[PDB]
Design a protein around this ligand. Sequence first.
Ligand SMILES: Cc1c(C=O)c(-c2nnc3c4c(C[n+]5cc6c(C)n(C)c(C)c6c(Cl)n5)n(C)c(C)c4cnn23)c(C)n1C
Length: 330
Amino acid sequence: STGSATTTPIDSLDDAYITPVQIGTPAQTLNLDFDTGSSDLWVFSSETTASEVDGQTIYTPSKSTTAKLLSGATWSISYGDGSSSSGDVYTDTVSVGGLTVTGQAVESAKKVSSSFTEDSTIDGLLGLAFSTLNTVSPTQQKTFFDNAKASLDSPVFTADLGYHAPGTYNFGFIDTTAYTGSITYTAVSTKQGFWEWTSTGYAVGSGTFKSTSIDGIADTGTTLLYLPATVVSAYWAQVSGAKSSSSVGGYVFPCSATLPSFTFGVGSARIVIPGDYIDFGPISTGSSSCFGGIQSSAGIGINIFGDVALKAAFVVFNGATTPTLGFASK
Ligand SMILES: Cc1c(C=O)c(-c2nnc3c4c(C[n+]5cc6c(C)n(C)c(C)c6c(Cl)n5)n(C)c(C)c4cnn23)c(C)n1C
């Protein structure tokens, strides 16, 4: 089997991407944030504290003839931005782009933190990291991909995120029309539950490539690119007026700037992020100071190849017995 679904930016800055997912019988379609940095499929629901729902579409398990309460199971998660959610668990039929999993754990939120409430466009998350990170207790549950894998034509999914435009998540096949050149595959460590890999270096603009190992995670849930402070300083030093602002929370730059590109290495291959992918717009409405899309990972404890990086590539998440990642230009 295969599946193919379009993923759409939630706003004009590509702050996140939503992908429609069918849950239950008859189907209830919710728009989920596909997140290769976590492993829970959770949704706003008829159980979510009413004051914490503000415009999201909810899953109502009592209206699904295939929903079954997973007795005694609870979940609770907290994300890298400090947001969180928790609740109980059903199993139900879940379909993505024509690919169906029966008996998928659907984690129903009873509580969500303010950033979830305040974002009406995201109805939940669909985790695509390794199932070892799943938070369901006392019996850990499998991701949608893990459940689907054995049925897929090939045990892979691909992320093809757009810059200020829709893109595609495919399951079970590699669309050879979706990229240029070849796909370069690179080793993955699953020891922390992530799609963790080692980039071979970077360049800023038309500058020379610096060969240096950068260990980090391919994380579709993360908006920005988080790299070591040395690398990030070298990038922003090429932008007149750019500075790190403690009050704002990162590097900012004059909105009048023309940003240089940023290149990262995948083996001997190179992925070029155009400068405009690095512009996240005014820090507050009407400001002439703009927020940068490349930020320091100092304090995070891990480097994160988030959407800024991934949207410059066609990315293969290869879930073979030994997982690997593939990157192609496009
Ligand atoms: C260690 C880490 C992260 C790891 O991932 C991270 C991060 N970066 N984007 C996101 C996340 C997103 C994506 N996301 C970002 C958004 C931004 C920047 N803005 C203005 C809006 C309105 C957003 C929405 Cl609705 N959604 N979502 C939905 C969740 C649950 C995230 C959790 N963390 N996160 C940050 C800021 N940090 C420090």
